[PDB]
Amino acid sequence: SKILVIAEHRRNDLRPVSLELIGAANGLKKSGEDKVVVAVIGSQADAFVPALSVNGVDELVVVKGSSIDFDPDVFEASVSALIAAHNPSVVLLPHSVDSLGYASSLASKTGYGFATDVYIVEYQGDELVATRGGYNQKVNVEVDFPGKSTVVLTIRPSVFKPLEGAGSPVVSNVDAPSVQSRSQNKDYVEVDIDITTVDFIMSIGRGIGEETNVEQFRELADEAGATLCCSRPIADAGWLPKSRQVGQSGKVVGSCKLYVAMGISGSIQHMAGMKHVPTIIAVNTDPGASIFTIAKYGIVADIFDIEEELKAQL
Amino acid sequence: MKILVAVKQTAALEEDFEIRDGMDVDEDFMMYDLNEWDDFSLEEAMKIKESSDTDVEVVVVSVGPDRVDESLRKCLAKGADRAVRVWDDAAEGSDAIVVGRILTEVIKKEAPDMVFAGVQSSDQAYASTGISVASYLNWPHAAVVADLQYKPGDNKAVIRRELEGGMLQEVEINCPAVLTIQLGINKPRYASLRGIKQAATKPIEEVSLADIGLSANDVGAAQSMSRVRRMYIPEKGRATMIEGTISEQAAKIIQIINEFK
Ligand SMILES: Cc1cc2nc3c(=O)[nH]c(=O)nc-3n(C[C@H](O)[C@H](O)[C@H](O)COP(=O)(O)OP(=O)(O)OC[C@H]3O[C@@H](n4cnc5c(N)ncnc54)[C@H](O)[C@@H]3O)c2cc1C
Ligand SMILES: Nc1ncnc2c1ncn2[C@@H]1O[C@H](COP(=O)(O)O)[C@@H](O)[C@H]1O
């Protein structure tokens, strides 16, 4: 047995989730006799071998492709060929924006067992069982893969712990398949204020309603010493600038010691940017809103009367 | 020119839903609507039809049973030209890879020049179908597109994908292509009362699995790539509720706030 991990990197830095999957992998394999192969794909992919060379990796495959960074044609080709050349029982991808661009391609093209954004993984006997969400993280769905020599899972980021230490994979090289990709990467693009890396935050979500309602949570925040922030919808609508979006695609509020989430439900991608704050207060009218399940204190109530009165005592 | 937009009617549960038996939530606690992503994706196609002095055909297509007609009617009303619903009871419980297949055979008949899909659905959040379509079809693809630069008939197209921590990356892609559209690429419209009304005269077009060359044997949970073993509600938290008044709930927040300064 082998477990195939595929790493992830962008613009020359190895993305942390890579190290998380090795973790996953290692905590999964049934006998320490089983190996864990890790591949890394890119025209300058070499650079990474020092960083990839770490506890848990038995083999490191470096795959020189046509492009520097992710490209769905190149990636599906390479992983297909590694799958062929290693016949893993289980191949693990980071459930990430790159992965979204190819992973389901793989699974479709042959019979592979397939499951995505999985956050618990384990064997029971000779039988792989995986757990992901349902009905908008209102339930867990526990699934299995009858019949499946090989199962491909995309893994949620920040669920699995990486290992401490250095190691010594056998390192190897392949050429990616010769693939004449049907898309071509161009420029990376960015579109003052603060960097919401900072102490105390008040963060509004859809919960608030209408652009006119922001001024009073802007004012609430001014008056507690809080920095106004928000979930994605507020910024999509253009009501606060994209600088103030917490989340998987906005900023991760690293030095936040206090975070009050008002009218934010706690989507997966919001938690991504804030799940590690030590004190999280959540105010929300819907008692089963996911945000409550990582808060320390919860209030169930309208954000509007919690607002005034706060703004009234302060 | 023709743009096919694939759309999903998704379920939300009400508070205090429960479970069968074991293997799903109770059919009663679900409310149906058009997947949030699909608004932006259909808007994007209408945005193309709108901007070009040539004729463009937007058609929406759904794999679902007939509670879905109601969502298709909404697409109709928001500008879409034609609407098609694929169904057989056999199809029930098909995961994203099977829906991929069913969508493909419809897309092979329609012959469109571009296909849009949603980054994900809000219920199952699989984030896999659209790209799966890309695969059976063998078309070029991109997932998670925040901006599209395309003119009907062009043969390359410049998109921007939205990456983690914020950045965007442009990518030039050949067309025909599939792309899965992200929230925020645009501000989708609301139907007008006239829209609602004319749409009420349109047909939603029924297509069965045999019409696309498929049978009981190609679809539904049995030919999916994952089998449900069971669902369950997760225990939800170790957190402290505060009960009582505004003056109190708020008095507490202010204690905590102050405990931190
Ligand atoms: C690839 C991708 C990237 C993403 N990136 C991000 C990201 O960076 N950041 C992000 O935030 N999301 C992100 N998401 C978007 C995400 O899926 C959700 O759509 C979003 O996080 C939901 O925002 P919300 O919780 O404010 O809205 P909702 O999910 O609509 O929740 C609103 C909440 O307010 C509550 N409420 C309503 N009225 C009141 C009231 N009067 N008093 C108290 N509570 C009230 C409701 O109970 C509800 O729980 C991303 C999604 C995708 C797939
Ligand atoms: N059953 C379906 N019928 C039509 N389109 C669908 C269906 N399921 C998924 N889709 C497409 O899949 C998208 C993304 O959600 P996901 O099911 O997470 O892959 C939706 O926006 C639709 O484009």
Coordinates of all heavy atoms in Angstrom, one line a residue, chain B residues 24-71, unseen atoms left out:
Chain B
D24 N -30.9 10.1 5.5 CA -31.2 11.4 5.0 C -32.1 12.3 5.9 O -32.7 11.9 6.9 CB -31.7 11.4 3.6 CG -31.6 12.7 2.8 OD1 -31.5 13.8 3.5 OD2 -31.7 12.9 1.6
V25 N -32.3 13.6 5.6 CA -33.1 14.5 6.4 C -34.5 14.3 5.9 O -34.8 13.8 4.8 CB -32.7 15.9 6.3 CG1 -33.7 16.8 7.0 CG2 -31.5 16.1 7.1
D26 N -35.5 14.7 6.8 CA -36.8 14.4 6.4 C -37.4 15.3 5.4 O -37.5 16.6 5.6 CB -37.7 14.4 7.7 CG -39.3 14.3 7.4 OD1 -39.8 14.0 6.2 OD2 -40.1 14.4 8.4
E27 N -37.9 14.7 4.3 CA -38.4 15.5 3.1 C -39.2 16.7 3.4 O -39.4 17.6 2.6 CB -39.1 14.6 2.0 CG -38.4 15.0 0.6 CD -38.8 16.6 0.1 OE1 -40.0 16.9 0.3 OE2 -37.9 17.3 -0.7
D28 N -39.7 16.8 4.7 CA -40.7 17.9 5.1 C -39.9 19.1 5.5 O -40.6 20.1 5.7 CB -41.6 17.4 6.3 CG -42.6 16.2 5.9 OD1 -43.2 16.3 4.7 OD2 -42.8 15.2 6.6
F29 N -38.6 19.1 5.8 CA -38.1 20.2 6.5 C -37.4 21.1 5.6 O -36.9 22.2 6.0 CB -37.2 19.8 7.7 CG -37.9 19.1 8.8 CD1 -37.8 17.7 9.0 CD2 -38.7 19.9 9.7 CE1 -38.4 17.1 10.1 CE2 -39.3 19.2 10.8 CZ -39.2 17.8 11.0
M30 N -37.3 20.6 4.3 CA -36.6 21.2 3.2 C -37.4 22.4 2.5 O -38.4 22.3 2.1 CB -36.3 20.2 2.2 CG -35.3 19.2 2.7 SD -35.2 17.6 1.8 CE -34.1 16.9 3.2
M31 N -36.7 23.5 2.3 CA -37.3 24.5 1.4 C -36.4 24.7 0.1 O -35.2 25.0 0.2 CB -37.3 25.8 2.1 CG -37.8 25.7 3.4 SD -37.2 27.2 4.4 CE -35.9 26.4 5.3
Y32 N -37.1 24.7 -1.1 CA -36.4 24.7 -2.4 C -36.2 26.1 -3.0 O -37.1 26.9 -3.1 CB -36.9 23.8 -3.3 CG -36.9 22.4 -2.8 CD1 -38.0 21.7 -2.3 CD2 -35.7 21.7 -2.8 CE1 -37.9 20.5 -1.8 CE2 -35.6 20.4 -2.3 CZ -36.7 19.8 -1.8 OH -36.5 18.6 -1.3
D33 N -35.0 26.4 -3.5 CA -34.8 27.5 -4.3 C -33.6 27.3 -5.3 O -33.0 26.2 -5.3 CB -34.3 28.6 -3.3 CG -35.1 29.9 -3.4 OD1 -35.1 30.6 -4.5 OD2 -35.7 30.2 -2.4
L34 N -33.4 28.3 -6.1 CA -32.3 28.4 -7.1 C -31.0 28.6 -6.4 O -30.9 29.6 -5.7 CB -32.5 29.6 -7.9 CG -31.6 29.6 -9.1 CD1 -31.6 28.2 -9.8 CD2 -31.8 30.7 -10.0
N35 N -30.1 27.7 -6.6 CA -28.7 27.8 -6.0 C -28.1 29.2 -6.0 O -28.0 29.8 -7.1 CB -27.8 26.8 -6.7 CG -26.3 27.0 -6.2 OD1 -26.0 26.9 -5.1 ND2 -25.5 27.2 -7.2
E36 N -27.6 29.6 -5.0 CA -27.2 31.1 -5.0 C -26.2 31.4 -6.1 O -26.4 32.4 -6.8 CB -26.6 31.5 -3.6 CG -26.2 32.9 -3.4 CD -25.6 33.1 -2.0 OE1 -25.6 32.1 -1.2 OE2 -25.0 34.2 -1.7
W37 N -25.2 30.6 -6.3 CA -24.3 30.8 -7.4 C -25.0 31.0 -8.8 O -24.5 31.8 -9.5 CB -23.3 29.6 -7.5 CG -22.2 29.8 -6.5 CD1 -20.9 30.5 -6.8 CD2 -22.2 29.6 -5.1 NE1 -20.3 30.6 -5.6 CE2 -21.0 30.0 -4.6 CE3 -23.2 29.0 -4.3 CZ2 -20.7 29.9 -3.2 CZ3 -22.9 28.9 -3.0 CH2 -21.7 29.3 -2.4
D38 N -26.0 30.3 -9.1 CA -26.6 30.2 -10.4 C -27.1 31.6 -10.9 O -27.1 31.9 -12.1 CB -27.7 29.2 -10.4 CG -27.1 27.7 -10.3 OD1 -25.9 27.6 -10.2 OD2 -27.8 26.7 -10.2
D39 N -27.5 32.5 -9.9 CA -27.9 33.8 -10.2 C -26.8 34.5 -11.0 O -27.1 35.1 -12.0 CB -28.1 34.7 -9.0 CG -29.3 34.3 -8.1 OD1 -30.5 34.0 -8.5 OD2 -29.0 34.3 -6.8
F40 N -25.6 34.5 -10.4 CA -24.5 35.2 -11.0 C -24.1 34.5 -12.3 O -23.8 35.3 -13.2 CB -23.4 35.0 -10.0 CG -23.6 35.7 -8.8 CD1 -24.0 35.0 -7.7 CD2 -23.5 37.1 -8.7 CE1 -24.2 35.6 -6.5 CE2 -23.7 37.7 -7.5 CZ -24.1 37.0 -6.4
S41 N -24.1 33.2 -12.4 CA -23.8 32.6 -13.6 C -24.9 32.9 -14.7 O -24.5 33.2 -15.9 CB -23.7 31.1 -13.3 OG -24.4 30.3 -14.0
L42 N -26.1 33.0 -14.4 CA -27.1 33.3 -15.4 C -27.0 34.7 -15.8 O -27.0 35.1 -16.9 CB -28.5 33.0 -15.0 CG -29.7 33.6 -15.7 CD1 -29.9 33.0 -17.0 CD2 -30.9 33.3 -14.8
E43 N -26.8 35.5 -14.8 CA -26.6 36.9 -15.0 C -25.4 37.1 -16.0 O -25.5 37.8 -16.9 CB -26.4 37.7 -13.7 CG -26.3 39.3 -13.9 CD -27.6 40.0 -14.6 OE1 -28.8 39.5 -14.5 OE2 -27.3 41.1 -15.1
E44 N -24.3 36.3 -15.7 CA -23.2 36.5 -16.6 C -23.7 36.2 -18.1 O -23.4 37.0 -19.0 CB -22.0 35.6 -16.2 CG -20.7 36.1 -16.9 CD -20.4 37.5 -16.5 OE1 -20.8 38.0 -15.4 OE2 -19.8 38.2 -17.4
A45 N -24.3 35.0 -18.3 CA -24.8 34.9 -19.7 C -25.7 36.0 -20.3 O -25.5 36.5 -21.4 CB -25.5 33.6 -19.9
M46 N -26.7 36.5 -19.5 CA -27.5 37.6 -20.0 C -26.6 38.8 -20.2 O -26.9 39.5 -21.2 CB -28.5 38.0 -19.0 CG -29.6 37.1 -18.6 SD -30.7 36.6 -19.8 CE -30.7 38.0 -20.8
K47 N -25.6 39.0 -19.4 CA -24.7 40.1 -19.5 C -24.1 40.0 -20.9 O -24.3 40.9 -21.7 CB -23.7 40.2 -18.3 CG -23.3 41.4 -17.3 CD -21.7 41.6 -17.6 CE -20.7 41.7 -16.4 NZ -20.4 40.6 -15.5
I48 N -23.6 38.8 -21.3 CA -23.2 38.6 -22.7 C -24.3 38.9 -23.8 O -24.1 39.6 -24.7 CB -22.6 37.1 -22.9 CG1 -21.2 37.1 -22.3 CG2 -22.6 36.7 -24.4 CD1 -20.7 35.7 -21.8
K49 N -25.4 38.2 -23.7 CA -26.5 38.6 -24.6 C -26.8 40.1 -24.8 O -26.6 40.7 -25.8 CB -27.7 37.7 -24.3 CG -29.0 38.0 -25.0 CD -29.9 37.1 -24.4 CE -31.4 37.3 -24.7 NZ -31.9 36.4 -25.7
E50 N -27.3 40.8 -23.7 CA -27.3 42.2 -23.5 C -26.1 42.9 -24.4 O -26.4 43.6 -25.3 CB -27.2 42.6 -22.0 CG -28.4 43.0 -21.1 CD -29.6 42.0 -21.3 OE1 -29.6 41.5 -22.4 OE2 -30.4 41.8 -20.4
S51 N -24.8 42.7 -24.1 CA -23.8 43.5 -24.7 C -23.4 43.4 -26.2 O -22.7 44.2 -26.7 CB -22.5 43.4 -23.9
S52 N -23.8 42.3 -26.8 CA -23.5 42.0 -28.2 C -24.6 42.4 -29.2 O -25.7 41.9 -29.0 CB -23.1 40.6 -28.4 OG -23.0 40.2 -29.8
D53 N -24.2 43.1 -30.2 CA -25.2 43.4 -31.4 C -25.6 42.1 -32.2 O -26.4 42.2 -33.1 CB -24.9 44.6 -32.2
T54 N -25.0 41.0 -31.9 CA -25.5 39.7 -32.5 C -26.4 38.9 -31.5 O -26.3 39.0 -30.3 CB -24.3 38.8 -33.1 OG1 -24.5 37.4 -32.6 CG2 -22.9 39.0 -32.5
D55 N -27.2 38.1 -32.2 CA -28.1 37.2 -31.5 C -27.4 36.1 -30.7 O -26.5 35.5 -31.2 CB -28.8 36.5 -32.6 CG -30.3 36.6 -32.5 OD1 -30.9 36.7 -31.4 OD2 -31.0 36.8 -33.6
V56 N -27.9 35.9 -29.4 CA -27.2 35.0 -28.5 C -28.3 34.2 -27.8 O -29.2 34.7 -27.3 CB -26.4 35.8 -27.4 CG1 -26.3 35.0 -26.2 CG2 -25.1 36.0 -27.9
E57 N -28.1 32.8 -27.7 CA -29.2 32.1 -27.0 C -28.9 31.5 -25.6 O -28.0 30.7 -25.5 CB -29.6 30.9 -27.9 CG -30.7 30.2 -27.2 CD -31.4 29.4 -28.2 OE1 -31.5 29.9 -29.3 OE2 -32.0 28.2 -27.9
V58 N -29.5 32.0 -24.6 CA -29.2 31.6 -23.2 C -30.1 30.5 -22.9 O -31.3 30.7 -22.9 CB -29.4 32.7 -22.2 CG1 -29.1 32.3 -20.9 CG2 -28.4 33.7 -22.5
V59 N -29.7 29.3 -22.5 CA -30.7 28.4 -22.2 C -30.3 27.7 -20.9 O -29.1 27.5 -20.8 CB -30.9 27.2 -23.3 CG1 -29.7 26.9 -24.1 CG2 -31.5 25.9 -22.7
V60 N -31.3 27.5 -20.0 CA -31.0 26.9 -18.7 C -31.4 25.4 -18.5 O -32.4 25.0 -19.1 CB -31.6 27.6 -17.6 CG1 -31.2 29.0 -17.7 CG2 -33.0 27.5 -17.8
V61 N -30.6 24.7 -17.8 CA -30.9 23.3 -17.9 C -30.7 22.7 -16.6 O -29.7 23.0 -15.9 CB -30.0 22.6 -18.8 CG1 -30.2 21.1 -18.6 CG2 -30.0 23.0 -20.3
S62 N -31.6 21.9 -16.2 CA -31.6 21.4 -14.8 C -31.9 19.9 -14.8 O -32.8 19.4 -15.4 CB -32.6 22.1 -14.0 OG -32.2 21.9 -12.6
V63 N -31.1 19.3 -13.9 CA -31.5 17.9 -13.7 C -32.1 17.8 -12.4 O -31.4 17.9 -11.4 CB -30.3 17.1 -13.7 CG1 -30.7 15.6 -13.8 CG2 -29.6 17.4 -14.9
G64 N -33.4 17.5 -12.4 CA -34.2 17.4 -11.1 C -35.5 16.9 -11.4 O -35.8 16.5 -12.6
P65 N -36.4 16.7 -10.4 CA -37.7 16.2 -10.7 C -38.5 17.5 -10.9 O -37.8 18.5 -11.3 CB -38.0 15.4 -9.4 CG -37.1 16.0 -8.4 CD -36.2 17.0 -9.0
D66 N -39.8 17.5 -10.7 CA -40.6 18.6 -11.2 C -40.7 19.7 -10.1 O -41.2 20.8 -10.5 CB -41.9 18.2 -11.7 CG -42.7 17.6 -10.6 OD1 -42.2 16.6 -10.1 OD2 -43.9 18.0 -10.2
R67 N -40.4 19.5 -8.9 CA -40.3 20.7 -8.0 C -39.3 21.7 -8.5 O -39.3 22.8 -7.9 CB -40.0 20.3 -6.6 CG -38.6 20.1 -6.2 CD -38.3 19.2 -4.9 NE -37.1 18.4 -5.1 CZ -35.9 18.8 -5.6 NH1 -35.5 20.1 -5.9 NH2 -34.9 17.9 -5.7
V68 N -38.6 21.4 -9.5 CA -37.5 22.3 -10.0 C -38.1 23.3 -11.1 O -37.6 24.4 -11.4 CB -36.4 21.4 -10.7 CG1 -35.2 22.2 -11.0 CG2 -36.1 20.3 -9.7
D69 N -39.3 23.0 -11.6 CA -39.9 23.8 -12.6 C -40.0 25.1 -12.1 O -39.8 26.1 -12.8 CB -41.2 23.2 -13.0 CG -41.2 22.1 -14.0 OD1 -40.1 21.5 -14.3 OD2 -42.2 21.7 -14.6
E70 N -40.3 25.2 -10.8 CA -40.5 26.5 -10.2 C -39.2 27.4 -10.4 O -39.3 28.5 -10.8 CB -41.0 26.4 -8.8 CG -40.5 27.4 -7.8 CD -40.9 27.0 -6.4 OE1 -42.2 26.8 -6.2 OE2 -40.1 26.7 -5.5
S71 N -38.1 26.8 -10.1 CA -36.8 27.6 -10.3 C -36.5 27.9 -11.8 O -36.3 29.0 -12.2 CB -35.6 27.0 -9.6 OG -36.0 27.1 -8.2

